[PDB]
A paper describes a structure:
The first ORF (ORF 1a/b) encodes two polyproteins, pp1a and pp1ab, and these polyproteins are processed via a main protease (Mpro, also known as the 3C-like protease) and one or two papain-like proteases (PLPs) into 16 nonstructural proteins (nsps). Among these nsps, Mpro and nsp12 (RdRp) of SARS-CoV-2 are functionally and structurally conserved among these viruses and essential for viral replication; they are considered a potential target for the design of antiviral drugs.
GC376, a dipeptidyl bisulfite adduct salt, exerts strong inhibitory effects on picornaviruses and coronaviruses. The latest research has shown that GC376 can also inhibit the replication of SARS-CoV-2 in Vero E6 cells. Moreover, antiviral treatment with GC376 led to a full recovery in laboratory cats with feline infectious peritonitis (FIP) caused by feline coronavirus (FIPV). Here, we evaluated the antiviral activity of a remdesivir parent nucleotide analog, GS441524, which targets the coronavirus RNA-dependent RNA polymerase enzyme, and a feline coronavirus prodrug, GC376, which targets its main protease, using a mouse-adapted SARS-CoV-2 infected mouse model. Because GC376 and GS441524 target the key proteases Mpro and RdRp of SARS-CoV-2 replication, respectively, their combined application may be more effective in the treatment of COVID-19. The combined application of GC376 with RDV produced additive sterilizing additive effects against SARS-CoV-2 in Vero E6 cells. Our results showed that GC376, which effectively inhibited the virus at the cellular level, was less effective in vivo. However, the ability of high-dose GC376 (i.m. or i.n. and i.m.) was weaker than GS441524.
Author numbering:
A (entry chain B), B (entry chain A): 4 to 301
The structure:
């Protein structure tokens, strides 16, 4: 099963930010509210916004932050890359222990989709090699965050800004820097040709070996270099050698060093599953980290 | 995408319940903790328990409940079918507006998987027509619950007790009545042959149209009864008029009559998918309801 982190600690940080006509969501940690900076744009400064001068003309009194129907007072505003920061006069007493990280393509996280500051639902998604995510997001959803958890700490890794022509989504880390070559302005922009997350496909074959039925399992072996070619053709990312021993635990538990493994991914890009399905998916699955496999078998 | 309801309201009601060697999760609402009654069994008892034998042989102090760090004093106990009800001297201040509901086959709910009283993950499930669910659950997971939300109100519908031999799962409503012909005994049980949830498959074909994927549309048309005849043969639940009604929503926003979308699915069942995906998959997905489709497309 694809599984999301429990969302309570992030729900307790979600607020509604309105500036003029635009409402979106804010992230309220301590006495600071983070939200996408295009909240300060009207329907039409959005096509080529000069954010610096948009923001000049805004003052604290132009921002309506609400936790429920309770207004939080804005007492300062600043722009950091593509996110806005609003100092409010109340520290969120729900503030989890947390930090801001910038994730890598292939890494997974959980999205807490919200609308008008109220959580709608939660889902697990991955950062594609072309820096999009395959999410469900509608209008008013910008400012929603992705996150991971480690014990008590919430690691905020994504904030939402944009849908792309092809239906996928684009956003920034919590310091406002976009993932990939995207800009927060309403223009057609390059999706970018995507690839399969090789390390996660191997994580998930391992899960097959663990949780039982390894029918895919075949009796042939390879090394690193040829492995790249015929699948690089079905468009698979370079497995390095340091994806390698994040796959170390799963190799040690199954007994299988990385490459009998490769050579059965061969045959699944060499003559399909033969109509068969591994663990619940009639296709190869590439949105499970090795850590995702260990967590869930753990 | 499969989207679970946000989980914070349930997370604040989850506690650990211990009785001797046996530990699992409980649901802490007002001044009552509910958990699976096989918490009272030893490894050996669970072979063939007479739960009323076992329960008359215990007093309050044999139950240890913990809410994070803090122990809750059990001051009463009580059994309602397959769930135990433990009264405690404190009311859970995080108790939401809630309800207890028994759901029908085909309905969905989100599951908050917990271990030792602590949330670990959240995902969606359907009640199969055979009254099992295709979960992800290990030892210590019992007591985790399934629920839906409805504005402010968490309606609990599932409590977890068991993995059948085939890897699927079985449990009770929160009054403790099993979904299906199972019992809280550790003895091998079979679930009975599953069917496919038809009304949901149509809801996912509609979902697919909305998201640009329309190769499967035909322009044949069919009777409700003609459709159920063919469907039957492929082990699809009857499609009721109610189900037709329920689909009406999605039938407006796409301009496809239910019955014509039946015609297309009927062609899908007589001829297979010949190598094509719908919404990415080589199988027809039946674990989205109408309501889960609207919710995530409005
Ligand atoms: C912010 O709430 C919103 C999120 C979008 C809207 C629907 N689904 C989403 O992901 N962002 C915008 O509406 C964005 C504002 C600009 C200042 C970046 N405009 C936008 O998303 O245009 C790109 C697009 C291309 C194709 C379809 C839909 C949107
Ligand atoms: C409750 O904590 C536990 C959850 C099972 C354990 C593995 N995955 C689950 O969902 N329930 C039981 O152990 C249950 C006990 C009642 C029948 C008294 N028996 C059961 O689920 O099947 C036994 C089993 C044990 C270990 C692995 C797989 C199945």
């Amino acid at each position: 099963r694809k599984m999301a982190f429990p969302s309570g600690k992030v729900e307790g940080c979600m607020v509604q930010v309105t500036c003029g006509t635009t409402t979106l969501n804010g992230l309220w940690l301590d006495d600071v509210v983070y939200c996408p900076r295009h909240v300060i744009c009207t329907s039409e400064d959005m096509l080529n916004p000069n954010y610096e001068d948009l923001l000049i003309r805004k003052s604290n009194h132009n921002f309506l932050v609400q936790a429920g129907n309770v207004q939080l007072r804005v007492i300062g505003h600043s722009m950091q890359n593509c996110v806005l920061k609003l100092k409010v006069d109340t520290a969120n007493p729900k503030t989890p222990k947390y930090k801001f990280v910038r994730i890598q393509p292939g890494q997974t996280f959980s999205v807490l989709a919200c609308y008008n500051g109220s959580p709608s639902g939660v889902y697990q998604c991955a950062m594609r090699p072309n820096f999009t995510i395959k999410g469900s997001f509608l209008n008013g959803s910008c400012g929603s965050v992705g996150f991971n958890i480690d014990y008590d700490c919430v690691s905020f890794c994504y904030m939402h800004h944009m849908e792309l022509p092809t239906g996928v989504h684009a956003g920034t880390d919590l310091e406002g820097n976009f993932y990939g070559p995207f800009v927060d302005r309403q223009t057609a922009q390059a999706a970018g040709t995507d690839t399969t997350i090789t390390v996660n496909v191997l994580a998930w074959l391992y899960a097959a070996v663990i949780n039982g039925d390894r029918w895919f399992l075949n009796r042939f072996t390879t090394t690193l270099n040829d492995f790249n070619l015929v699948a690089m053709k079905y468009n698979y990312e370079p497995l390095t050698q340091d994806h390698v021993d994040i796959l170390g635990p799963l190799s040690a538990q199954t007994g299988i060093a990385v490459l009998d493994m490769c050579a059965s991914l061969k045959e699944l890009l060499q003559n399909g599953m033969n109509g068969r399905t591994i663990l619940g998916s009639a296709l190869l699955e590439d949105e499970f980290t090795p850590f995702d496999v260990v967590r869930q078998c753990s």
